[PDB]
Fold:
Amino acid sequence: ATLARQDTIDEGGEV
Amino acid sequence: CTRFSDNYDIKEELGKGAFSIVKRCVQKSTGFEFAAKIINTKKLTARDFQKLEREARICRKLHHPNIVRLHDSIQEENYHYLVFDLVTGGELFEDIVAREFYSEADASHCIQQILESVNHCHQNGVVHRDLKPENLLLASKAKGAAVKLADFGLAIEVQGDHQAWFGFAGTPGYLSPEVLKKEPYGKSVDIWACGVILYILLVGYPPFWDEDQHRLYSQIKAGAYDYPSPEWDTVTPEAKNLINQMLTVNPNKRITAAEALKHPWICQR
Ligand SMILES: Nc1ncnc2c1ncn2[C@@H]1O[C@H](COP(=O)(O)OP(=O)(O)O)[C@@H](O)[C@H]1O
Ligand SMILES: [Mg+2]
Structure:
C-alpha cells in the first residue's frame, strides 16, 4: 500500500 | 458573456481534477491574483451543469479561513469559470508525499484544521463527500501552515444528523462503509474520510488498499485495517484511539467532528 492520487467518481443514483 | 476572458489574464496550471483544470489568473483592473477553476462545458450534460451551479452556491454559503473562498462564477460560450482566492502552498497530498509523514505534533495540528473546516460545513448543514488530501490545500509551504478545504464539486445539503441516499460518489480509498453498502448516509461520511486522512498523516500510506477495487471496498465495509510494525510502534495509543473512533464502521457509532476536536490527542497540547 502506498499514497497515490485517486480520481473522484460520481455514479449518481440519488433517490 | 465574455466577463472572464476580458477581466482576467490566465497564467500557469496549479492542478487538475477529474475534468477540470485550475489555473492561476490575474484580474486586469487590480493586478490581484486568483485561482480559476476552468470547466469545459460543451462536454457537459444538464445534470453536470446543475452540479456546477450547486458547487458555486454551496461555496458561497461557507465563509471560513480554512475553506477556499469563491470570488466569482462566470459562464462563457464553451467554458465555465469559478474564480477562487489563490492558495499557494500546493495540495496537502504533495506535502505528505514530500515529507513521507507528519510528526504526531504536525499531524495533530493539521487534522485539527481539517476537522474545523469539516465541522464548519456540518454545522452549516453541508456534507462535502470528498475529503481527501488532494482536496485540501496549504496556505503555504511552512510547517504548520494553514490548511484550506477545497473542491465542493460533490457537496450537498443535509440537516443535522439526517441520512438519505445521495448517490454513489466520492473517492474509492476514502469512501465510507455506508456509501459502499448503499445505505442512507449523511455528515458522518466526512469523518470516516478524515480518519483515513489522519492515518495517512501518521505513516504516509492509507489504511485500506488493494490492487483489486472489489477487495478494497470489501476491506472498507469491514473496517479491516491494522497498525503494522514498525511504522506504528512509535505512534501513541492516544492517536490510534482517535483514528479508531473516526474509522468506526457503523456511522451511528462514529465520532462526530465536534467531539473529535475534543479528543485529548488533539487538545492535550
Ligand atoms: N484555490 C486554489 N488555489 C490553488 N490551487 C488550487 C485552488 N483550488 C484548486 N486548486 C488545485 O486544483 C485542483 C483541482 O481543484 P478541485 O477544486 O479539486 O477541482 P475537482 O472538483 O475537479 O477535483 C486541486 O487539487 C488543487 O491542486
Ligand atoms: Mg479535487
User: Anything to note?
Assistant: Residues A 8; B 14-18, 20, 22, 35, 37, 68, 84, 86-87, 91, 134-135, 137, 150-151, 153 surround adenosine-5'-diphosphate (ligand 1) (CB under 6 Å). Residues 8 and 14 of chain A are 17 Å apart (CA to CA). DSSP finds no helices and one strand in chain A. The beta strands of chain A are 9-12.
